[PDB]
Amino acid sequence: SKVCEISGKRPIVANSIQRRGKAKREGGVGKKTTGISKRRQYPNLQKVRVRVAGQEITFRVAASHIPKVYELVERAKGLKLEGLSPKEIKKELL
Amino acid sequence: MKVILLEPLENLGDVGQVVDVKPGYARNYLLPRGLAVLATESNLKALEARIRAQAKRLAERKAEAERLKEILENLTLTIPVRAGETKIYGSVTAKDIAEALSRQHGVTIDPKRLALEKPIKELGEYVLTYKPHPEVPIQLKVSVVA
Amino acid sequence: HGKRYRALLEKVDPNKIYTIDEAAHLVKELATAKFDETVEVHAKLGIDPRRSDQNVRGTVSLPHGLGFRNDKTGAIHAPVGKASFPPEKLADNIRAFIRALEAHKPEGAKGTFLRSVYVTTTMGPSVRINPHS
RNA sequence: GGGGCCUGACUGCGAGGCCUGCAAGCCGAGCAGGGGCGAAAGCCGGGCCUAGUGAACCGGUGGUCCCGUGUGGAAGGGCCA
RNA sequence: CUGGUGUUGGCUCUUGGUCGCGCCUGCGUAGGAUAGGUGGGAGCCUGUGAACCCCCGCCUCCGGGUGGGGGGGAGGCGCCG
RNA sequence: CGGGGGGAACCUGGGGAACUGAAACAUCUCAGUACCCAGAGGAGAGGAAAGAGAAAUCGACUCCCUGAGUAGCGGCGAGCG
RNA sequence: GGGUGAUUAGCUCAGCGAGCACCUCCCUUACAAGGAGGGGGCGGCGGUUCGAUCCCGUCAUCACCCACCA
Numbered sequence: 078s079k080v081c082e083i084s085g086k087r088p089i090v091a092n093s094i095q096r097r098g099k100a101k102r103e104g105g106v107g108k109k110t111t112g113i114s115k116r117r118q119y120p121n122l123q124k125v126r127v128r129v130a131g132q133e134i135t136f137r138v139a140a141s142h143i144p145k146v147y148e149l150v151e152r153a154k155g156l157k158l159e160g161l162s163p164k165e166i167k168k169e170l171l
Numbered sequence: 172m173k174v175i176l177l178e179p180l181e182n183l184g185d186v187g188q189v190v191d192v193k194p195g196y197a198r199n200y201l202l203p204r205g206l207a208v209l210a211t212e213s214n215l216k217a218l219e220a221r222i223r224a225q226a227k228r229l230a231e232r233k234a235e236a237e238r239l240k241e242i243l244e245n246l247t248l249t250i251p252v253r254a255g256e257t258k259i260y261g262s263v264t265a266k267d268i269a270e271a272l273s274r275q276h277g278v279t280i281d282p283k284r285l286a287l288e289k290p291i292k293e294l295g296e297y298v299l300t301y302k303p304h305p306e307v308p309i310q311l312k313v314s315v316v317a
Numbered sequence: 318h319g320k321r322y323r324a325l326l327e328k329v330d331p332n333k334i335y336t337i338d339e340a341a342h343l344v345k346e347l348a349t350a351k352f353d354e355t356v357e358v359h360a361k362l363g364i365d366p367r368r369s370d371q372n373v374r375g376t377v378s379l380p381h382g383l384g385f386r387n388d389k390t391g392a393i394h395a396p397v398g399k400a401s402f403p404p405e406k407l408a409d410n411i412r413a414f415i416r417a418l419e420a421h422k423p424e425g426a427k428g429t430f431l432r433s434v435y436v437t438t439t440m441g442p443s444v445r446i447n448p449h450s
Numbered sequence: 451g452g453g454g455c456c457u458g459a460c461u462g463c464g465a466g467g468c469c470u471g472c473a474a475g476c477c478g479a480g481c482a483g484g485g486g487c488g489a490a491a492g493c494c495g496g497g498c499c500u501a502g503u504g505a506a507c508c509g510g511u512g513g514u515c516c517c518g519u520g521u522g523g524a525a526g527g528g529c530c531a
Numbered sequence: 532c533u534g535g536u537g538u539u540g541g542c543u544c545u546u547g548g549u550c551g552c553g554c555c556u557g558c559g560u561a562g563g564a565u566a567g568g569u570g571g572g573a574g575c576c577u578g579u580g581a582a583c584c585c586c587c588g589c590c591u592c593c594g595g596g597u598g599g600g601g602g603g604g605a606g607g608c609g610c611c612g
Numbered sequence: 613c614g615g616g617g618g619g620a621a622c623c624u625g626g627g628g629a630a631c632u633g634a635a636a637c638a639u640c641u642c643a644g645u646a647c648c649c650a651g652a653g654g655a656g657a658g659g660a661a662a663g664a665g666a667a668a669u670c671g672a673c674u675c676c677c678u679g680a681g682u683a684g685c686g687g688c689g690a691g692c693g
Numbered sequence: 694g695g696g697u698g699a700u701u702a703g704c705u706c707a708g709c710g711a712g713c714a715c716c717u718c719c720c721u722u723a724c725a726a727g728g729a730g731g732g733g734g735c736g737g738c739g740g741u742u743c744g745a746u747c748c749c750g751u752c753a754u755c756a757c758c759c760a761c762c763a
């Protein structure tokens with residue numbers, strides 16, 4: 078679970094490549110790899126707490142999709158339920 | 172970021188104005204304090220739909236007044252008062268001027284807002300003014316018997 | 318200054334770039350001078366004067382008659398004549414010498430070269446003009 | 451060893467051989483182009499000779515104009531140095 | 532450990548860059564004792580209160596430099612030297 | 613109302629070595645293999661062109677043959693394709 | 694291969710000509726310290742202006758953190 082509750086973004090595996098030397102494009106002999114190893118890239122994951130019907134709903138969202146939560150906030154129909162009201166504002170149509 | 176101001180906010184301007192401010196300001200101050208909303212395809216539609224609504228109610232009031240303005244800018248009422256010589260035993264109050272207009276010429280009036288001071292104690296020809304917002308002069312003749 | 322060109326500066330505008338043929342005809346009316354107006358229009362150039370290899374010289378006389386050298390600050394000056402010639406002929410003479418310049422334009426000279434040409438007289442203002450149109 | 455005039459310390463090739471496991475290394479007359487010295491015969495493809503050197507890869511630099519991913523260019527490469 | 536950036540907002544004072552235009556700026560006897568460059572150009576600005584004046588300001592290479600205002604009201608004057 | 617758990621091998625997805633080869637070794641190889649995990653089913657995946665790619669051409673996807681050890685990729689090595 | 698910096702009379706510096714020196718001379722009594730006089734000397738030329746150790750390309754070496762090296 079470092080996974081955006083809106084976009085679905087989750088951590089991915091990326092290699093980290095250490096290169097040495099001077100690009101061929103600069104007239105160097107060209108670049109050499111002194112190591113490759115696995116790393117991860119996490120989504121930029123933030124809390125956003127927002128007030129909806131009675132309650133305080135807090136989402137974990139990739140900062141890219143922070144707007145989607147407020148779009149989702151507009152979206153007001155008939156929910157008197159618990160702080161697990163978000164299952165309703167979670168997505169519906171999308 | 173586009174927000175519709177819900178309240179005159181002073182440098183970042185007037186109500187219903189669509190102002191562009193930083194999201195942090197928007198999300199963590201304006202929106203949660205009910206000081207504005209996101210200017211969306213909908214919330215901007217509801218705004219323009221409601222700039223029309225008011226500008227109808229107003230522009231049908233200025234076309235209400237002037238539409239009953241010309242009624243009594245031409246029509247005149249004459250009220251006989253118990254005579255005296257250029258002094259009235261009673262008076263004619265602004266209240267009275269209403270009652271006249273209903274009785275003769277059948278129009279209706281509130282009747283505040285002409286001149287409430289000095290309920291008029293003398294005979295003569297008077298020109299009195301009316302309301303709300305651009306408005307009417309009226310003509311009242313006072314003479315004698317009943 | 319005086320009211321010479323403080324009567325004349327609301328009709329002639331420095332701000333919004335102009336071209337020659339529309340801005341050529343006002344050169345004799347813009348000078349309120351009492352006497353003998355000799356017009357001079359000029360631009361500076363994008364060559365470094367700090368090296369003499371890039372300088373420019375000569376004597377080329379104008380077709381119409383009397384009636385080019387770069388400084389060490391890198392601008393350009395030259396007389397085009399005397400009172401003489403009228404307002405409407407200079408669309409012919411305003412592109413005349415201006416094309417004798419670029420003949421000796423240096424090769425190792427770097428940058429846009431005719432930069433701001435402001436049509437002026439000895440007696441007159443700052444107004445934008447295009448070197449070409 | 452001294453002097454004069456020069457730049458053959460050439461370009462295009464190279465019969466035939468020395469050596470040699472390979473790859474190398476070596477010598478080379480002669481023909482063509484344009485030259486140098488010489489009256490000429492002729493000599494001159496560095497130095498009396500035998501050490502003074504380094505495959506290939508990758509890349510730099512100048513040049514030819516060979517290729518140019520639908521086509522014209524361009525990017526990049528090839529070829530000669 | 533750390534620069535930039537996202538999450539990250541309000542209000543301020545404060546500065547650098549650079550651009551546009553406005554604005555001033557600069558001294559090797561000398562030209563007339565106070566010439567930034569360079570080609571023009573033979574004068575002109577001036578009453579839309581000049582010649583100076585005074586208070587009041589800015590830079591001061593300080594003799595000097597310079598504008599706001601008024602007391603200011605019919606000359607200063609360019610090459611010419 | 614549905615789910616849960618199991619199933620020889622097969623399938624897709626999330627993750628993912630080393631020995632070894634390179635007659636040393638680090639990029640490279642082994643290999644997206646082994647293995648772990650999740651999920652399908654009797655199959656699974658894929659599929660109806662924001663495709664190919666040089667013809668004014670073809671026409672979803674899958675699978676076999678071929679194209680071809682070609683085009684290329686490559687400490688331009690081993691080797692990959 | 695950069696940023697470029699250290700450019701300086703005999704040594705070091707400073708300006709988009711000084712100190713420890715060296716010589717004669719005072720002072721003590723004497724090293725001295727001082728005090729006063731004398732001494733072509735500006736990485737390199739071509740070029741800039743009235744003038745230019747006080748303006749600009751090669752590049753002549755010099756460091757410090759740097760590039761790269763089949």
Ligand SMILES: [Mg+2]
Nearest residue numbers: 092093094095
């Ligand atoms: Mg990395």
Ligand SMILES: [Mg+2]
Nearest residue numbers: 107108109110
């Ligand atoms: Mg490589």
Ligand SMILES: [Mg+2]
Nearest residue numbers: 112113114640
């Ligand atoms: Mg590995």
Ligand SMILES: [Mg+2]
Nearest residue numbers: 123124125126
């Ligand atoms: Mg938040």
Ligand SMILES: [Mg+2]
Nearest residue numbers: 140141142143
């Ligand atoms: Mg974003």
Ligand SMILES: [Mg+2]
Nearest residue numbers: 168169170171
């Ligand atoms: Mg969608």
Ligand SMILES: [Mg+2]
Nearest residue numbers: 464465466467
């Ligand atoms: Mg042979």
Ligand SMILES: [Mg+2]
Nearest residue numbers: 469470473474
């Ligand atoms: Mg052999």
Ligand SMILES: [Mg+2]
Nearest residue numbers: 478479480495
């Ligand atoms: Mg031969």
Ligand SMILES: [Mg+2]
Nearest residue numbers: 482483484485
């Ligand atoms: Mg021959």
Ligand SMILES: [Mg+2]
Nearest residue numbers: 486487488489
């Ligand atoms: Mg001969």
Ligand SMILES: [Mg+2]
Nearest residue numbers: 488490492493
């Ligand atoms: Mg011969």
Ligand SMILES: [Mg+2]
Nearest residue numbers: 506507687689
């Ligand atoms: Mg190799």
Ligand SMILES: [Mg+2]
Nearest residue numbers: 507508509510
């Ligand atoms: Mg090569």
Ligand SMILES: [Mg+2]
Nearest residue numbers: 515516517518
């Ligand atoms: Mg070609």
Ligand SMILES: [Mg+2]
Nearest residue numbers: 518519521522
């Ligand atoms: Mg092409």
